[PDB]
């Protein structure tokens, strides 16, 4: 139950991330004590062609 | 529901109850300039001012021009009346335009502030007691008080009809003045002269024979 | 134009405005401006030798500018 | 408040009600900061007083008959002597700059050292017309209104002179002789397309 | 007049250049017949040259020491000496057409951005939507001013990606 | 109420019955608010008194053979001296504007400082014609009616002068001599077509 709801839209707060200040869909949130449990999928790929990434609880905000 | 094009899809922004309350609503907006309600309200005020100004100007051009055709008056053409009037005048056109700009700017600024805030011109102790009469009615662009001295706007039964007679006529006047300009650049004579020339021979005196409106023919 | 009178008057005037008019403002601005030698003087208002040199320099520049302009005859 | 500069418009929240001459006129929001507004108040009062004295002097010289305000310093540029009220002044331009510089430096230095005092009182008010602060609010409004009017008048003096070459009294008489034919719209300088 | 230039209707170098162009065209025409295709084409070119020179002189253009027309870009000088047709009116004409194109493109992007696959609409143009927006773009200045006044023309700073500084 | 301006019409509810000269005439609803009605009432009484003085002065000056009301200030346009009842006055136009301005400013300031008083009494009524408030309402009606008639008469004076060129007494004699041949319809500007 920790973290954002699955399927919701969040804004990335990681400064070095390609999707900084961008909206992405929440895929899954790990229930353990991992550093980056939130899984976010994006519509636009980065320079490496990846569309998903892992972020911490404080690195994503419900937007 | 009267429409400007039977069968055409009327825009959704012109079908709302607020937009349908405007006079002369025929669903005519192909460019979609009135999609924004604030923009629609501003354009409604602009259309009302244009209607009244065009009606006054077209009347001042047509009635003296029609009386000049007969022996009632001797008013010159509208495109030449400015020079004739400024010749035997007490002031040059620049000084007159400056005084006009100041006098018009005062009332236009008051109307602008009323558009931004309806009824805001009724601030007590601001216009020597005349501010009580400067508050418009519930409809923007339709004030009472000093305006409308006959009180013909108090009767609601004819109110909706009266507005329909003001916008439509105004729209016609807006086109009339436009024609007055185009004809001046296509025939070189006044509107009454063009009307008489066309009535004398309509099958040969029209815009298809002036050599300007149809450059490919 | 007497050069001595003009120079003496300009220097005395600048020293007077620096000792009785702008001394408090200068002291307030110098303290708020934040190895050294303390030029302590017996002047009751703290007007030291450095202030004398600065105000005298300004007075001399003003006096020589006035003398120069008057010498140009215009 | 003294009134409303725009009837029907909301007054700015940064303008206090007890401030004299508060008409709510601040479209550019220059006095939004409280520190800037404090300096602007004394600056406006000082400007109004200086403009009142300047306009009064400019009108007095032309009314009495000693030229206009623009032709007054013309004696110091090409072999002349200053004449106050028709009496020859025994001071040249070199002595005037020293006296004025020292006097103004001392007076303005004391005023600056005071700490932004707008209404000193005491020695500056020997008649005691503002001894009580209750009635001083109405008298301050008259001072700020006359100051703003005098500032506008001095700006008009400079503009009308730069556009025509005549003094304020001479321009007034010309306008009275021909209002429609002699104004800012007929000088050929203000509006270039008229 | 302006900048020491002279009107093209009075410039001697302007008439000299017109005579030179007509002279070389006539010299080329002297080698052909009188009722052939090259003769008719050369005569048409000569008439076009004469009409162009007369139209440029009639327009009131200013010619320099070289006899060529010079344009006035200052709005004050152009409006004061009747040169607004050189650089003023074409300026506003370009601004209208350029803003027209930009507004139509922006409207198309905003319209297709809310679909399932906006990239597909970007490579395969939706002709009906593009035609409708192209026709509706005639009121682009009014619509743009309204969008700017409502605050919907720009995007917030928090919704735009930036580098880590 | 004093009467009905339009027979068959209902009097407005914002006009008090005890108001002098209340005929229920307010189609534009100008005095709808009570604050505006007070100022307009005082303004109407002041206008009526000034109009009565003006019309009486114009009629007396033209009946005594000292010119009409329009040619009275013509002495200061081409050079001359003002004459009152045939007696010369040595005051030029410059000294008249200053004295009139000072006197009118002081009198009007004293009148306005009372808070808009329409019927002061006391020093202004040394004969005590309105000592009792019972007969005060009747005389007030006569004053407002005579003032309204004087305002209409002054407007007629200005309009008839701008239309013909003669004075009020000269226009009355011309109309008495030829009523059908001399009226507003024969001046040439009131009716354009005829």
The enclosing domain of B78 has a CATH number of 1.10.3460.10
Neighbours of chain B (3+ CB pairs under 8 A): D, E, F
User: Cβ(D71)–Cβ(D157) under 8 Å?
Assistant: no
Nearest alpha carbon to residue D193 among F157, B212, B94, B145: B94
Q: Strand runs (DSSP E) across chain A, as ranges? A: 9-12, 23-29, 38-41, 52-55, 60-62
Q: Burial, B204: exposed, middle or buried (Cβ in 10 Å; 0-12, 13-18, 19+)?
A: exposed
Name the residue among F29, F39, F193 with its Cβ closest to that of B133. F29
What's phi and psi for A34, nearest 5 deg?
-70, 155
Nearest CA to CA, how far is E23 from chain B (Å)?
A: 33
Chain B residues with CB under 8 Å of F32 CB are 132-133
CA D95 to chain centre: 26
Dist. CA B91–CA B76, nearest whole Å = 20
Nearest partner of A21 among E157, E75, F117, judged by Cα: E157
Q: By the 8 A CB rule, do F42 and F118 touch?
A: yes
Helices (H), E59-115: 75-80, 89-112
- DSSP code string of B94-151: HHHHHHHHHHHHHHHHHHHHHHHSTTGGG-TTSSTTGGGGG-B-SSTT-B-TTS-TT-
Q: How far is CA F124 from the centre of its chain?
A: 19
**End-to-end Cα spacing for chain F:** 42
Q: Is F187 annotated as a binding residue?
A: no
CB contact under 8 A, F29 and B145: yes
H helices present in chain B, as ranges: 17-20, 37-69, 81-87, 93-116, 156-184, 191-200
- Alpha carbons B177 and D48: distance in angstroms, whole number: 51
Q: Which of D95, D97, D113 to mutate to test the interface with C (most CBs of C within 10 A)?
A: D113
DSSP, collapsed to helix, strand or coil, labels residue D141 as helix
The nearest CA of chain C is from the CA of D121 a distance in Å of: 21
The SS3 call for residue F31 is coil
The CA distances from residue D157 to D109, D162, D164, in Å, are: 30, 9, 11
- Determine the Cα angle at F44 with ends F42 and F45, to 5°: 65
> Are residues A21 and E164, on separate chains, in Cβ contact within 8 Å?
no
Report the greatest alpha carbon distance in chain C: 49
User: Which of F27, F32, F193 comes nearest B132 by C-beta?
Assistant: F32
Residue B194 counted as an annotated binding residue: yes
Residue D94's closest CA among D75, D79, D76, D80?
A: D76
Burial E73-98 (b: 16+ CB within 10 A, else e): eeeeebeeeebbebebeeeeeeeeee
Structural determination approach: cryo-EM
- This structure's resolution (Å) is 17.1
Terminal-residue alpha carbon distance, chain B: 41
Taking phi over 0 as left and psi of -120 to 50 as alpha, with beta for the rest, F128 belongs to left
Which DSSP state fits B36? S
How many Å apart are CA F23 and CA C55, to the nearest integer? 84
Helix (H) or strand (E) holding E63: strand E62-63
**DSSP code for E78:** H
Domain span at residue B152?
12-200
Does any domain span residue B91? yes
Q: Which residues contact F121 (CB under 8 A, 6 or more apart)?
A: F130
Residue of B nearest to D183 (CA): B95
Q: What's the rounded Cα separation, in Å, for the pair C38 and F48? A: 85
Burial class from Cβ neighbours inside 10 Å (0-12, 13-18, 19+) for residue E164 reads: exposed
Write the burial class of residue D162 (CB in 10 Å: 0-12 exposed, 13-18 middle, 19+ buried).
Answer: exposed
Residue E64's contacts (CB-CB under 8 Å, 6 or more residues apart) are E5, E6, E70
d(CA B138, CA D154): 45
Element (H, E) at F87: strand F87-88
Residue B135 near chain D (CB below 8 Å): no
Residues whose CB is less than 8 angstroms from the CB of residue B87 and which lie 6 or more positions away in sequence, other chains included: none
CA distance C8 to E52: 79
Q: Is B73 on the interface with F (CB under 8 A)?
A: yes
The answer, for A19 touching chain E at a CB cutoff of 8 Å, is yes
Number of folded domains that form chain A:
1
Q: Point out the residue among F27, F32, F40 whose CB comes nearest to the CB of B149.
A: F27
Q: Binding residue per annotation — F143?
A: yes
Burial of B132 (0-12, 13-18, 19+ CB in 10 A): buried
Q: Is B12 helix (H, G, I), strand (E, B) or coil?
A: helix
Handedness of CA B47, B52, B53, B55 (dihedral sign): positive
Residues of C in contact with D94 (CB under 8 A): 1, 66, 70
Test B129 with F193 for CB contact under 8 angstroms: no
Do residues B51 and B173 touch, judged by C-beta distance below 8 A? yes
Separation of CA F125 from chain center: 21
Contacts 24+ apart (CB under 8 A), F39-42: F39/B128, F39/B129, F39/F116, F40/B129, F41/F118, F42/F116, F42/F117, F42/F118
Question: Are D185 and B131 in contact (CB < 8 Å)?
Answer: no
CA dihedral B177, B180, B186, B187 (to 10 degrees): 170
Indicate the DSSP class of residue F9: P
CB atoms within 10 A of CB B190: 21
Other chains touching F, judged by 3 or more CB pairs under 8 Å: B
Which residues, 6+ apart, have CB-to-CB distance to B7 below 8 Å? Answer: none
Closest CA relative to residue C16, chosen from C57, C50, C59, C49: C59
Q: Which chains touch C (3 or more CB pairs under 8 A)?
A: D
Out of D97, D98, D109, name the one closest to residue C22 (CB). Answer: D109
**What does DSSP say about strands F83-84 and F87-88: parallel, antiparallel, or unpaired?**
antiparallel
Detail the DSSP E strand segments found in chain D: 83-84, 87-88
Nearest to C21 among D97, D98, D105 (CB): D105
Fold classification of E1-165 (topology level): Helicase, Ruva Protein; domain 3 (1.10.8)
Bridge-based pairing of strands A38-41 and F87-88 is unpaired
By the 8 A CB rule, do E106 and E98 touch? Answer: no
Touching check for B129 and chain E: CB below 8 Å?
Answer: no
Q: How far apart are CA D145 and CA F125, in angstroms?
A: 38
Residue B212 lies in a domain: no
Q: Do chains D and C touch (3 or more CB pairs under 8 A)?
A: yes
B208 within a domain of the structure (yes/no): no
> Who's near A45: CB < 8 A, 6+ residues apart?
A51
Left, alpha or beta for E82 (phi > 0: left; psi -120 to 50: alpha)?
Answer: left
E160–A21: do the CB atoms touch at under 8 Å? yes
Q: Are F143 and F45 in contact (CB under 8 A)?
A: yes
DSSP single-letter state for residue B208: T
Q: Which DSSP string do the residues of C7-58 spell out, in sequence order?
A: HHHHHHHHHHHHHHTSHHHHHHHHHTT----------TT---HHHHHHHHHH
Chain E interface, Cβ < 8 Å to B: 135-136, 138-139, 142-143, 146, 149-150
């Amino acid at each position: 139950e920790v973290g954002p709801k699955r399927g919701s839209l969040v804004k990335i707060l990681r400064p070095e991330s390609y999707w900084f200040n961008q909206v992405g869909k929440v895929v899954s949130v790990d229930q353990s004590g991992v550093r980056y449990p939130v899984v976010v999928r994006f519509e636009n790929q980065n320079y490496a062609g990846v569309t998903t990434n892992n972020y911490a609880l404080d690195e994503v905000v419900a937007a | 529901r009267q429409s400007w094009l039977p069968g055409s899809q009327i825009p959704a922004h012109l079908d709302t109850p607020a937009a349908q309350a405007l006079a002369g609503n025929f669903g005519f907006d192909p460019l979609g300039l009135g999609k924004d309600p604030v923009a629609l309200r501003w354009y409604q005020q602009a259309e009302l001012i244009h209607c009244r100004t065009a009606m006054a100007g077209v009347a001042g051009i047509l009635i003296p021009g029609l009386l000049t055709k007969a022996g009632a008056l001797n008013v010159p053409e509208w495109y030449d009346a400015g020079k004739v009037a400024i010749e035997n005048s007490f002031a040059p056109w620049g000084s007159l335009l400056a005084v006009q700009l100041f006098l018009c700017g005062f009332v236009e600024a008051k109307r602008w502030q009323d558009i931004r805030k309806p009824g805001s011109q009724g601030e007590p102790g601001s216009f020597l007691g005349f501010e009580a009469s400067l508050k418009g009615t519930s409809e923007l662009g339709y004030p009472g008080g000093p305006f409308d001295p006959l009180g013909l706007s108090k009767e609601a039964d004819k109110w909706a009809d009266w507005k329909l007679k003001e916008v439509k006529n105004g729209r016609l006047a807006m086109l009339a003045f436009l024609g007055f300009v185009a004809q001046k650049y296509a025939t070189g004579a006044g509107p009454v002269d063009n009307l008489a020339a066309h009535l004398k021979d309509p099958w040969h005196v029209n815009y298809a024979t002036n050599g300007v409106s149809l450059p490919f023919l | 134009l007497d050069p001595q009178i003009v120079i003496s008057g300009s220097t005395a005037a600048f020293l007077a405005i620096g000792r009785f008019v702008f001394l408090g403002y200068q002291r307030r601005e110098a303290n708020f401006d934040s190895n050294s030698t303390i030029f302590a003087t017996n002047d009751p208002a703290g007007f030291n030798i450095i202030d004398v040199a600065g105000w005298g320099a300004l007075g001399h520049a003003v006096g020589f500018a006035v003398l120069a302009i008057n010498s140009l005859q215009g | 408040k003294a009134g409303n500069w725009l009837p029907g418009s909301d007054a700015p929240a940064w303008l206090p009600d007890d401030l004299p001459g508060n008409y709510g006129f601040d479209p550019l929001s220059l006095g939004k900061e409280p520190a800037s507004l404090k300096r602007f108040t004394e600056s406006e009062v000082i400007h109004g007083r200086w403009a009142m004295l300047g306009v009064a002097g400019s009108l007095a010289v032309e009314l009495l008959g000693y030229g206009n305000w623009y032709d007054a310093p013309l004696w110091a540029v090409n072999g002349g002597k200053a004449t106050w009220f028709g009496i020859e002044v025994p001071f040249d331009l070199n002595a005037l700059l020293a006296f004025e510089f020292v006097a103004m430096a001392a007076a303005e230095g004391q005023r600056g050292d005071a700490g932004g005092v707008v209404y000193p009182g005491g020695a500056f008010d020997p008649l005691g017309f503002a001894k009580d602060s209750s009635k001083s609010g109405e008298l301050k409004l008259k001072e700020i209104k006359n100051g703003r009017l005098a500032m506008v008048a001095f700006l008009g003096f400079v503009a009308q002179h730069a556009a025509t070459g005549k003094g304020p009294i001479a321009a007034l008489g010309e306008h009275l002789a021909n209002p429609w034919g002699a104004n800012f719209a007929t000088n050929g300088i203000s509006v270039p397309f008229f | 007049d302006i900048a020491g230039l002279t009107p093209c209707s009075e410039s001697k170098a302007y008439a000299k250049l017109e005579k030179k162009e007509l002279k070389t065209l006539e010299k080329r025409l002297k080698q052909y017949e009188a009722d052939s295709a090259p003769a008719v084409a050369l005569k048409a070119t000569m008439e076009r040259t004469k009409a162009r020179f007369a139209n440029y002189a009639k327009a009131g253009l200013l010619c320099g020491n070289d006899g060529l027309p010079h344009l006035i870009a200052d709005p004050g000088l152009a409006l004061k000496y009747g040169h607004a047709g050189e650089v003023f009116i074409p300026t506003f004409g370009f601004l209208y057409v350029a803003g027209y194109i930009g507004y139509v493109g922006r409207q198309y992007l905003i319209a297709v951005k809310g679909e399932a696959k906006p990239t597909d609409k970007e490579i395969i143009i939706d002709v009906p939507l593009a035609t409708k927006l192209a026709w509706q773009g005639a009121g682009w200045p009014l619509a743009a001013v309204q969008e700017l006044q409502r605050g919907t023309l720009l995007e917030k700073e928090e919704n735009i990606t930036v580098s880590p500084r």
